[PDB]
């Protein structure tokens, strides 16, 4: 699209409509973009000394990108609630994007006095990496997505990436991608950039919780017909004499019943409690946390494989890195106290996946014989096994929406671990930069790189609309399901509202599983 | 009750705002809400036209009805006019019932 200077390049679309089966969440926000790295690509690396587990090598670019991989960039409390309360599941189908009403300003810091003014002509160029030839950054839970609250103006993030490294230094194989080596489209004012995408058949996120659970799944009333090993030894006057007898598992017997499927896999996490007291006093934050390691650098295992966060009656506990944790609007960056964060809870799964903090089961160790007692041992890490079945990490309104499946020789069940939809070809990276403006050059020629540009930034609005599909409920469940509600009682502030000084804020994390489906 | 026409779906609310103008941002990224905008306001004209219907009189009333008139006698200022310093002003409230219909 194209037009004039006194012509709005696009209108403001920010609705949300439900169609019974679909529902489209349109949404627009105003943004701003500075000139990063003063227009140059800069090489960047870990700090020489820095622990090995923390080295790196890569580049930062003068390019800034766009991102809305956060559910709340599309759903509004209320809306989300609608969804989350009457749908067995849902998934994204297609999207449409558009930047417009772009405007380029140029600040002038003459002595003690700045003065911003329109640089009409100068441009901002955009380009979408629709061929995925660029290090996909999104999906890395970074923060600089869209504001949950419309009215909020925002700054565009700067693109940076990482290649290979042998400590703080580069290794040859590492590649250096240059963003100008693409065909950016250049916008001036009166210019807009639209583009549209279509998702790929993915599974509806399961937005329901299970009423039955693996173990308790058969019918009480009837005993099976298969037998199991009831007792081993037997009374012989005073002493026992080994004599194995078997029984037919019934209701009273349950624990012993024969089955057909196994809980999901696991990778044991340390348990910490919301109650300061209980927790051993010391620094096992890193030392005790569950991790894995590549090329000799141990990394953390955050968002551990999807597994319930606490047994019955222990909402007080949680994994050291088995859950998602968001900050309460305002919460500072580092070492903030428990009271400043919102920890997610995944009890809803208990029913199928193991509890993060407790071992999977316990396999037998030795082979018993008359002169040898029967061994056994608990298992803290069980990789996928036939017959296992499980549930993936719920979603949360202010959580990630999707993530790119890495291009590898092999993947195994790609639901992104941080939760979300695992996409092979996700929404392409959208980039934006401000074509430089060489400030006054010298009369006599010089072949040096230009270094003195006009100080200036850009701004303008952006809009994103997405169509989601739904799987409606359908249970013959007689008694009421659970629903997500807002507290009745009076409060000094409404949830998901602007305070007295107009600061919007999300009180709690809102999950997705409320409706109840049987297993 | 304050008088007027009671409408089920009255003339829709019309709103207007000035899309903000982020004044000069810093070179290094920050995910905070933007708070420094360009100081500016808008202006321009607006127009409203409305079509009203009427029910004309029709009484066999012989003697004159009452009508609303403006005072004959001289005055320092005309009613519904700008004073000496150009300040328009409505002297009195003007009703609507003057014509006389039987009950």
């Amino acid at each position, epitope marked *: 699209g194209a037009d004039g200077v006194g012509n709005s390049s696009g209108n403001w679309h920010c609705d949300s409509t439900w169609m019974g089966d679909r529902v489209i969440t349109t949404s627009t926000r105003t943004w701003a973009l500075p000139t990063y790295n003063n227009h140059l690509y800069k090489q960047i690396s870990s700090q020489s000394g820095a622990s090995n587990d923390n080295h790196y090598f890569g580049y930062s670019t003068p390019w800034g990108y766009f991102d809305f991989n956060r559910f709340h960039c599309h759903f509004s409390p209320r809306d989300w609630q609608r969804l989350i309360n009457n749908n067995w599941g849902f998934r994204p189908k297609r999207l449409n994007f558009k930047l417009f009403n772009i405007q380029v300003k140029e600040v002038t810091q003459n002595d003690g006095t700045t003065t911003i003014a329109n640089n009409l002509t100068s441009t901002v160029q955009v380009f979408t990496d629709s061929e995925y030839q660029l290090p996909y950054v999104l999906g890395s839970a970074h923060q600089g997505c869209l504001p949950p609250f419309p009215a909020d103006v925002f700054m565009v993030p700067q693109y940076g990436y990482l290649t290979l490294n042998n400590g703080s230094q580069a290794v040859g194989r590492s590649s250096f991608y240059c963003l100008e080596y693409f065909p950016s489209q250049m916008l001036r004012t009166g210019n807009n950039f639209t583009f549209s995408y279509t998702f790929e058949d993915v599974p509806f996120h399961s937005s329901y919780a299970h009423s039955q659970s693996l173990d308790r799944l058969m019918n009480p009333l009837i005993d099976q017909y298969l037998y199991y090993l009831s007792r081993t030894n037997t009374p012989s006057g005073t002493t026992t004499q080994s004599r194995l007898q078997f029984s037919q598992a019934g209701a009273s017997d349950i624990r012993d019943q024969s089955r057909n499927w196994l809980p999901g896999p696991c990778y044991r996490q340390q348990r910490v409690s919301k109650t300061s007291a209980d927790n051993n006093n010391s620094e096992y934050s890193w030392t005790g946390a569950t991790k894995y390691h590549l090329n000799g650098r141990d990394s953390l295992v955050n968002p551990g494989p999807a597994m319930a966060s606490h047994k019955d009656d222990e909402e007080k506990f949680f994994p050291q890195s088995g859950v998602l944790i968001f900050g309460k609007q305002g919460s500072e960056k580092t070492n903030v106290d428990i009271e400043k964060v919102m920890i997610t809870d995944e009890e809803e799964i208990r029913t199928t996946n193991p509890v993060a903090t407790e071992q999977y089961g316990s396999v037998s160790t030795n082979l018993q014989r008359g002169n040898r007692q029967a061994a056994t041992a608990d298992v803290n890490t069980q990789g996928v096994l036939p017959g296992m079945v499980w549930q993936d990490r719920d979603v949360y309104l202010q959580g990630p929406i999707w993530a790119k499946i890495p291009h590898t020789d092999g993947h195994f069940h790609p639901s992104p671990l941080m939760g979300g939809f695992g996409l092979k070809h996700p929404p392409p990276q959208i980039l934006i930069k401000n074509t430089p403006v060489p400030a006054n050059p010298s009369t006599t020629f010089s072949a040096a790189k230009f270094a003195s540009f006009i100080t200036q930034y850009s701004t303008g609005q952006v809009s994103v609309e997405i169509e989601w599909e739904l799987q409606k409920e359908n249970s013959k469940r007689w008694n009421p399901e659970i629903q997500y509600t807002s507290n009745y009682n009076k409060s000094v502030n409404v949830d998901f509202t602007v305070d007295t*000084n107009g600061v919007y804020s999300e009180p709690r994390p809102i999950g997705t599983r409320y409706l109840t489906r049987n297993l | 009750l304050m008088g007027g026409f009671g409408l089920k779906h009255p003339p829709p609310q019309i709103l207007i705002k000035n899309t903000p103008v982020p004044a000069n941002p810093s070179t290094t990224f920050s995910a905070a809400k933007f708070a420094s905008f360009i100081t500016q306001y808008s202006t321009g004209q607006v127009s409203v036209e409305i079509e009203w219907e009427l029910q004309k009189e029709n009484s066999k009333r012989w003697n004159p009805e009452i009508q609303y008139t403006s005072n004959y006698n001289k005055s320092v200022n005309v009613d519904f006019t700008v004073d000496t310093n150009g300040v328009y002003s409505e002297p009195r409230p003007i009703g609507t019932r003057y014509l006389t219909r039987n009950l």
Partner: antibody
Amino acid sequence: SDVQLQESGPDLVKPSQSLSLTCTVTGYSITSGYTWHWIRQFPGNKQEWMGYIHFSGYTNYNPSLKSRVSITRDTSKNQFFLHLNSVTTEDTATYYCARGDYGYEWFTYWGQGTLVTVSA
Amino acid sequence: DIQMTQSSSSFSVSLGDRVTITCKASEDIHNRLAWYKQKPGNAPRLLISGATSLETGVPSRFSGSGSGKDYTLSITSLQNEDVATYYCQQYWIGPFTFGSGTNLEIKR
């Protein structure tokens, strides 16, 4: 110049220690209305707003102080308290408690103030 | 944080004179500004709130005006009680911030 409200607490505190002050209000009830704030003045002159506690019991703190400040209340006693941990020499100042006519405006009633010096 | 700057750091004046103090904000406060008076060895007292509304019991001699960034406090005829330092305070957004203060020495 003039007001009502009274603060109490130790005049001296050792550095890494915690400062605890109490504000006793008379002629008004801590519940039912108004937010009660804490403000301090360094000996030079400036006033700095520490944070407040609402009638409902909700609190807001200055971001600078947030990590080491806690404000609580005892309705029975009609007193509200200030706790500042990890005190430093910079913390030396006169501490005031004040009421905030709330909703639209601010601090209607102030205390006498108590001087707290942080020294070894 | 919004920064408030107060004009004259100090003024000397006698009973009966008119004094004017200024306060300007780093950003538009929208008249959420209050003025306080503080005597030596004393705590502050609320003179005006909402930029122009006098607190109950405050004498008519005090008045405030302003909008946007700049506000002013005026005392028509100074009284002996008037000696004190005056501070402006913004309550547009947290954290609330105060001006540096203006010391009015009334007393010859």
